[PDB]
Amino acid sequence: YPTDDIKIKEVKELLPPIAHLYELPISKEASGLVHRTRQEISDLVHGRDKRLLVIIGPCSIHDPKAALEYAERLLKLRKQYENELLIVMRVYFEKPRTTVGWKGLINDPHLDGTFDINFGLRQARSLLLSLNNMGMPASTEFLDMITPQYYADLISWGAIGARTTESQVHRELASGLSCPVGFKNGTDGNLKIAIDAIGAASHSHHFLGVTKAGHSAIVHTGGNPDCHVILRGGKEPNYDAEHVSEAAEQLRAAGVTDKLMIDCSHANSRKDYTRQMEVAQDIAAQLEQDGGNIMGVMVESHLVEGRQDKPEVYGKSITDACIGWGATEELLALLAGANKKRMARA
Amino acid sequence: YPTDDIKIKEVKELLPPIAHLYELPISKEASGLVHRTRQEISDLVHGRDKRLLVIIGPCSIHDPKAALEYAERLLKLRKQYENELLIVMRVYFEKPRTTVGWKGLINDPHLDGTFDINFGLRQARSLLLSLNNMGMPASTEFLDMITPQYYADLISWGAIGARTTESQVHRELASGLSCPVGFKNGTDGNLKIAIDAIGAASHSHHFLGVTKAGHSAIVHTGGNPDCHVILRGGKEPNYDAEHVSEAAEQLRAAGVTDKLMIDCSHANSRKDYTRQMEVAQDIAAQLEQDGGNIMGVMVESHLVEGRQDKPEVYGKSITDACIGWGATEELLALLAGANKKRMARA
Amino acid sequence: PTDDIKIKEVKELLPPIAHLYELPISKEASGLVHRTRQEISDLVHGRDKRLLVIIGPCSIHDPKAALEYAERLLKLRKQYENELLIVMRVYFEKPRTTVGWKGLINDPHLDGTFDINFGLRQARSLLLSLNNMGMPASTEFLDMITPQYYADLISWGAIGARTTESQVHRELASGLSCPVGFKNGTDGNLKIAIDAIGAASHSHHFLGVTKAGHSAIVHTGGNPDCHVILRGGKEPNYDAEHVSEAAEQLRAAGVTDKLMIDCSHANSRKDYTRQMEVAQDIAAQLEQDGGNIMGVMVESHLVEGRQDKPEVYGKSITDACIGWGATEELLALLAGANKKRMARA
Amino acid sequence: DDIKIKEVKELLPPIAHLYELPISKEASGLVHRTRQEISDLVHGRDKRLLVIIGPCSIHDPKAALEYAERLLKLRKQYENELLIVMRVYFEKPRTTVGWKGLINDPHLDGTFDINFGLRQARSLLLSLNNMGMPASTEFLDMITPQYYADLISWGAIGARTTESQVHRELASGLSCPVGFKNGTDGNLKIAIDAIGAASHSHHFLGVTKAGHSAIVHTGGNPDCHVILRGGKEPNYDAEHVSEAAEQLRAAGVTDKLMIDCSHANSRKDYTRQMEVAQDIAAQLEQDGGNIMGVMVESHLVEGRQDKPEVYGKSITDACIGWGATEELLALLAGANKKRMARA
Ligand SMILES: N[C@@H](Cc1ccc(O)cc1)C(=O)O
Ligand SMILES: N[C@@H](Cc1ccc(O)cc1)C(=O)O
Numbered sequence A, B: 001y002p003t004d005d006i007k008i009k010e011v012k013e014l015l016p017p018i019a020h021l022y023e024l025p026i027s028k029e030a031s032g033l034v035h036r037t038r039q040e041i042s043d044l045v046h047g048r049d050k051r052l053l054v055i056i057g058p059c060s061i062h063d064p065k066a067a068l069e070y071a072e073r074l075l076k077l078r079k080q081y082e083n084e085l086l087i088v089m090r091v092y093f094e095k096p097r098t099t100v101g102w103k104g105l106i107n108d109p110h111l112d113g114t115f116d117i118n119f120g121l122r123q124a125r126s127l128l129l130s131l132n133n134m135g136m137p138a139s140t141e142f143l144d145m146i147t148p149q150y151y152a153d154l155i156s157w158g159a160i161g162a163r164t165t166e167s168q169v170h171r172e173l174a175s176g177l178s179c180p181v182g183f184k185n186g187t188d189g190n191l192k193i194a195i196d197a198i199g200a201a202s203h204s205h206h207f208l209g210v211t212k213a214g215h216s217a218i219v220h221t222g223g224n225p226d227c228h229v230i231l232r233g234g235k236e237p238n239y240d241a242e243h244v245s246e247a248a249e250q251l252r253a254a255g256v257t258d259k260l261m262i263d264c265s266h267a268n269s270r271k272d273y274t275r276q277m278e279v280a281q282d283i284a285a286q287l288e289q290d291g292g293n294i295m296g297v298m299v300e301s302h303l304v305e306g307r308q309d310k311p312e313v314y315g316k317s318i319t320d321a322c323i324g325w326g327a328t329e330e331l332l333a334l335l336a337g338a339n340k341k342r343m344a345r346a
Numbered sequence C: 001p002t003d004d005i006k007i008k009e010v011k012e013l014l015p016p017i018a019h020l021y022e023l024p025i026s027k028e029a030s031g032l033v034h035r036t037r038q039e040i041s042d043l044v045h046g047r048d049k050r051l052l053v054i055i056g057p058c059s060i061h062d063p064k065a066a067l068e069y070a071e072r073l074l075k076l077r078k079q080y081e082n083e084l085l086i087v088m089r090v091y092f093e094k095p096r097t098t099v100g101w102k103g104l105i106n107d108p109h110l111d112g113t114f115d116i117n118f119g120l121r122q123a124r125s126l127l128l129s130l131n132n133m134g135m136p137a138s139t140e141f142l143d144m145i146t147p148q149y150y151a152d153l154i155s156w157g158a159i160g161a162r163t164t165e166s167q168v169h170r171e172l173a174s175g176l177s178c179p180v181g182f183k184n185g186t187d188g189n190l191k192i193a194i195d196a197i198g199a200a201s202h203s204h205h206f207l208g209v210t211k212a213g214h215s216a217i218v219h220t221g222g223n224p225d226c227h228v229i230l231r232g233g234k235e236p237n238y239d240a241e242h243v244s245e246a247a248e249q250l251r252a253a254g255v256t257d258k259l260m261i262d263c264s265h266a267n268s269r270k271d272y273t274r275q276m277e278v279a280q281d282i283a284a285q286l287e288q289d290g291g292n293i294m295g296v297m298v299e300s301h302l303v304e305g306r307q308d309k310p311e312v313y314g315k316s317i318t319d320a321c322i323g324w325g326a327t328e329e330l331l332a333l334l335a336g337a338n339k340k341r342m343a344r345a
Numbered sequence D: 001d002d003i004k005i006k007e008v009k010e011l012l013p014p015i016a017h018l019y020e021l022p023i024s025k026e027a028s029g030l031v032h033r034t035r036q037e038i039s040d041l042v043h044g045r046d047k048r049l050l051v052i053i054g055p056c057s058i059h060d061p062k063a064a065l066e067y068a069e070r071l072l073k074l075r076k077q078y079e080n081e082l083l084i085v086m087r088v089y090f091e092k093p094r095t096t097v098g099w100k101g102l103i104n105d106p107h108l109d110g111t112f113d114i115n116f117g118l119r120q121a122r123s124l125l126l127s128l129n130n131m132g133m134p135a136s137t138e139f140l141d142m143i144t145p146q147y148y149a150d151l152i153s154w155g156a157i158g159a160r161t162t163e164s165q166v167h168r169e170l171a172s173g174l175s176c177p178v179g180f181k182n183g184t185d186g187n188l189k190i191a192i193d194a195i196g197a198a199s200h201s202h203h204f205l206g207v208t209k210a211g212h213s214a215i216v217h218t219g220g221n222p223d224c225h226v227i228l229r230g231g232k233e234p235n236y237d238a239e240h241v242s243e244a245a246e247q248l249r250a251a252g253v254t255d256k257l258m259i260d261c262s263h264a265n266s267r268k269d270y271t272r273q274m275e276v277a278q279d280i281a282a283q284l285e286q287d288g289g290n291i292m293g294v295m296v297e298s299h300l301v302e303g304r305q306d307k308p309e310v311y312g313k314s315i316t317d318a319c320i321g322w323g324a325t326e327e328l329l330a331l332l333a334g335a336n337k338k339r340m341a342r343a
């Protein structure tokens, strides 16, 4: 007899995006920075500019106060290296787990299993707005279909994760995002799925979405021309020059941009934060020799290095382990110096 | 200044689930069949019953008339074999493409690229309701987060596709589905992602969803205890006894049900649909010898064998190629006879 | 604890779009509604001298009888089309003095089950058939939300005596696509109806509900085609002297001095047999002069009188109606008298 | 559809405002208690006089809070004789057209910023209740009450809407006591009918806290009463009170009523409010057993103005000033003290 909502415990009140947009409207200056940075990134994706996009910051945001502090330091390096590097902070609020775990600040901002999503969204949007108001553009992984309506207007670059690059509904979502999007290769190293994803996301789609007012609707997208691939390792790493060369060839064969991003962390560092510097060194070497197909890198970085299970220590990750502020200074100096040369020989 | 909905061509009106439910309420008999079949499948997932679940029918539904016809012939065999087999039809609307493609009857029911989703959802619900009214239970792939509200009440068994088994939001969805759910191994043969998915989908989750009235809300699920894995091939086929045994070991090590399903089609039968008979023969041999870990199989079958690009011929697939009615009779007789013996052993 | 505590339940309501999807307006219904709205406008502003006749049941409680009534009425609408513009009364919302059955929408099964989803569906289906067969429809707009479900099928709307003075009803009218008549107050006050025309002709902002069933701010453009309806008070107000006083008051307010006269309710003192007398008096005014009259309203059904329970087919369960025979008589009388008025131009 | 609709715009639902401005425990307690205390006056268990007093309309929250702070001293001073509740009327009905109030147009310049107005209304009501001043308002619209009814201790249905079935339905579901005014020409029967209608359960179309239309089923409002507010001639005197009470008993509803000192009872003249209150004082001294409350249009400064030039001066109906408010309240308190003394 019963066949409906058999395994639904309850359905709860959700404020629609407009309620958050009314409290936290985007400022003139945030609008300008987002607009500009999106353009600048587009220029890197299509080879019109040879600066290196650097998506850098925490694995996950679990404390907005630390995040603003981190941002203030990073901003000095963003300005310092602005002729060599386009620095954008990692501000990831949605985290895909292997089985189960804390899904992030949006899903559970009090870090205690209370799932205060209304608070989380409000907090996320507030942090993003403060970041952009101080001059730091922001990047995030879009994991969910609905959460983007709450803050995509504040995002200069989006990632689609390794676990969702093959998913049609994530490709559809990307096709309708106002920012450039990077698609990671699959968790075991499959690169073709990310190339296919760029293909798919560049076309118009019809999918089911939610309006700013919180109502489901049919969303007809125009396609996203600013997508690229991210090499993030597999069973084996894929950062080096031969993998970059292979990837580029495959990209040209698919008729899509052959400029790509390399993640220094995750499977490319064998899940070991001490190895991110090695990967960045290898990328620096490629940039010095040639490295024509590189347009960016990704780095997991925080105030304090490593990781912890409970949010005990300020500015230390509770998800993947990060390099510390001192290593970040070093890594960025390395990249800037190497890209200066690449840019010179052109 | 412009930063929002830059790559959105339009937002269109979508009737909510309750409009379709009002025109096509579930009947008492459909309700009784769905309820009973879900139970009967759960019994197979947990080793209470040793009948073989058979998920069988078209790769994709593109013509409801042919679908009802196919269903009428299948129904005779469902009855005939009911002591050995639990036959449920494949009624797949949502089709994930490699890159670009026809996404199904929901997404584009007129078969001309007009994306008439309101009509498609209505048509889908109507067919599901007729199928259940005549005594044929239905199964389908849940690809989207929102479409299930329109007809999950008519679905006795759900699949999460190979391309989405890794996706956290698909695992969340499954954790709240009222039916048993099978998770496919990854497109390159990764089994672990499916085993993880079961783990994830058995727990309670909080995520953003859409109510029957078409408004977004926070859904709190109770977890789905009736999930299992589906072996559907990878880089190599994974149907045989050794792969079954490896999978079962890995399932027991993760603490989840070690009863699984084998897909005779897709990567398991490669570039020849008729090899589905070969796979089924190998499964019959396992069932005769032992085959204690097998609880079901999946088969891509239609009125007429093969495939075509345009819907020229009646009852012939326009997606993956299917075995024809005569082979379906043979394949079902083979499975029934073999499982009769397995069941006889005590 | 201070919220929602006199509320027993909130129940599901299908939005207008669900009904519009099942029962889309046809091209012929579209055309008829659009044209009839125009033709009424013309009567309201004195461009045409045909008489608008809003005629039919006090309330609809049976769609089958309503369709039978409509088939007979359609023959007379056609016969008299040079003298009368006939539009059927299709009233689904009824205002009670205290409490009672509020109509088909509110309680379509007549048994206190308040099946509003079914009632809206039924209402829309009856309206669409009516317009498809060539009979335009009129109704009283009582509620703020219900119009989104079928106003597209309505050629003329009434705001009742009990609500002419209400700001939100004046706001609603300011945004209705049809001409609207405003009745004088239940004790005879005419100034409220003249004020209402003033209010409804202007643009307003108020809170409404979209076709998708969501609250929103609606910004109206104003309704230029409103008029008054004289429906009696403590005393009847249908005669030439009342018409003349009303016209003068309308001109003093700068609004249209063309009005409608209701033959029923306080004009007939709730005696359905007197509607014929009122119509006779209007026939006499039309023959003599009657330059300020643009329409009449009449409570008519298949069978005369009223009943408490819906036992007899085609007989009212609200106010008592004249029967089909008297309706023929009354319509012949009005058509013959207005023929002569039209001849003088 | 929509031939004469120029635009449809982006309304925040009640829950957005409730999240920013949740009701406090103290505002909760005051509202709950004051509704009870008013119920008690409606059904004749307490003989204090309900006094609904304040501006015709609220057009400036600053002056409203100033006014509230002065009124709160007198509320407390007279608490054994009078239950003072401030008039906080946002929504205003016009004869034809005009400024419809702070909700509809809070900038007073025809910008119709309804989202801002609803926010401002709720914020003022929450601040008022938090400082100890309960609030009353006219409910004109079917959707606005979802935004702030939780903060209202007493509600009025206006003379122009007492006869309206949808307003009677709305009342039947309001958590507060409700007064129904007699008709603009003096008809009392419509208000008596209204009490009858509002006391029963109804089914109608409303909007949820989330901003979605739905079917609302109400339980009926047992705490309704009539308000005598004049007609063609005034209706405040002892004979009209006696006649009204008799009509109320014949209908089987509470024969305790409220008298409005303003509007048609003062012949639209704010200087006459004091005379009316004098006549009510005299009835309270003599007997006045059927009176449970009064209404007064009062502000910081007297009279009215077309534009909001002077602070604390009405832009709608003309009000008495603060001095006269002190005098009027002292008169009512003294007279009711005696009524209460007689058993
Ligand atoms: N209606 C689904 C559960 C569901 C609810 C909300 C969603 O957004 C998605 C799925 C079922 O019971 O099977
Ligand atoms: N607002 C998103 C696009 C979007 C639209 C609708 C959705 O449901 C989701 C995302 C952006 O600016 O990128």
Ligand SMILES: N[C@@H](Cc1ccc(O)cc1)C(=O)O
Binding pocket: C144, C145, C147, C148, C151, C152, C172, C175, C176, C177, C178, C207, C208, C209, C210, C218, D001, D002, D003, D004, D005
């Ligand atoms: N749809 C109505 C106008 C209307 C719009 C919104 C409302 O809430 C009410 C009425 C018409 O076209 O006449």
Ligand SMILES: N[C@@H](Cc1ccc(O)cc1)C(=O)O
Binding pocket: C002, C003, C004, C005, C006, C007, D142, D143, D145, D146, D149, D150, D170, D173, D174, D175, D176, D205, D206, D207, D208, D216
């Ligand atoms: N919230 C109101 C009752 C109400 C409910 C629904 C409505 O649409 C209007 C009013 C109260 O507590 O008094």
Ligand SMILES: [Mn+2]
Binding pocket: A059, A060, A266, A300, A319, A320
């Ligand atoms: Mn990480």
Ligand SMILES: [Mn+2]
Binding pocket: B059, B060, B265, B266, B300, B319, B320
């Ligand atoms: Mn297939």
Ligand SMILES: [Mn+2]
Binding pocket: C058, C265, C299, C318, C319
């Ligand atoms: Mn009537």
Ligand SMILES: [Mn+2]
Binding pocket: D056, D057, D263, D297, D316, D317
């Ligand atoms: Mn006033």
